[PDB]
């Protein structure tokens, strides 16, 4: 299917206790490949996907330098947020971005975004034209006027529509041997009594990549979407994912209920019964 590069920056301040902690994490599709953590005597951008060992060494130096320089502007930004919001120097606060770019299977750009969060709430985003800024409150409005004056969005649009794109393609090819693979779920149903005359069916799906999946319960055909309780898609920790959806059923009617599992890794939608 399509593909993406997605980055996630978090800066957390700890007043009294020195300077802020700054973490960068980066994903292609649903696999993390790089990380930056400033809690080190000498922090470096580091690989987290093996195919990333193919980059030429100058890469890690250049990336480490940009991270430190970014970490510095986030210190500034946090301090600036206290002025904008008339807060005291006492507490710990959070500042975040997330951004990225999307590409079709053929490799063509089609979407980009940029977003900014103070203490967990929307702060300022880039509109979908990749040219104007949506400022969430009167405080962010001060940042919105700044970034129009300095024509910030152009550098943003530029990165999002060009360098981001060129780079994601190189990463995809560099990690072809795994990144364009799609392991199918390995499903199964489990039986737990829920009452005297009521039982719980649970439909499992383990070991699958990528993380997008459909678990639906059907009774004779019609979905039980409002009578199913899914759990959050969770990671297995080895680069695979897990999910389950469950329905509580009037006892003895198990054969009525059926579970369809769609997945990119399934030649055809698997169906299952207890």
């Amino acid at each position: 299917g399509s593909h993406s590069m997605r980055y996630f920056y978090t800066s957390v301040s700890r007043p009294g206790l020195g300077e802020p902690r700054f973490i960068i994490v980066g994903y292609v599709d649903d696999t993390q490949f790089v990380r930056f953590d400033s809690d080190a005597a000498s922090p470096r951008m580091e690989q987290r996907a093996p195919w990333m060992g193919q980059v030429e060494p100058e890469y890690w130096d250049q990336q480490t330098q940009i991270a430190k320089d970014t970490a510095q502007t986030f210190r500034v930004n946090l301090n600036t947020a206290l002025r904008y919001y008339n807060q005291s120097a006492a507490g710990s606060h959070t500042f975040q971005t997330m951004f990225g770019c999307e590409v079709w299977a053929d490799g063509r750009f089609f979407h980009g975004y940029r977003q900014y969060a103070y203490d967990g709430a929307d702060y300022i985003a880039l509109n979908e034209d990749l040219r104007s800024w949506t400022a969430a409150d009167t405080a962010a409005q001060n940042t919105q006027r700044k970034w129009e004056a300095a024509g910030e969005a152009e550098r943003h649009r530029a990165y999002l529509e060009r360098e981001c794109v060129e780079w994601l393609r190189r990463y995809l090819e560099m990690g072809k041997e795994t990144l364009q693979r799609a392991d199918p779920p390995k499903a199964h149903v489990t039986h737990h009594p829920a009452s005297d005359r009521e039982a719980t069916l649970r439909c499992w799906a383990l070991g699958f990549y990528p993380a997008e999946i459909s678990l639906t319960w059907q009774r004779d055909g019609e979905d039980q979407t409002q009578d199913t309780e899914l759990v959050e898609t969770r990671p297995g920790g080895d680069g695979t994912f897990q999910k389950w959806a469950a329905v509580v059923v009037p006892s003895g009617e198990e054969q009525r209920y059926t579970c369809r599992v769609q997945h990119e890794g399934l030649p055809e939608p698997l169906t299952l019964t207890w």
Binding site: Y7, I24, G26, Q63, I66, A67, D69, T70, T73, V76, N77, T80, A81, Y84, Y116, Y123, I124, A140, T143, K146, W147, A150, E152, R155, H156, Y159, E163, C164, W167
Partner: peptide, 9 residues
């Protein structure tokens, strides 16, 4: 590849 440009709010 992270962007070199990083703006001040």
């Amino acid at each position: 590849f992270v962007p070199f440009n990083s703006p001040n709010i």
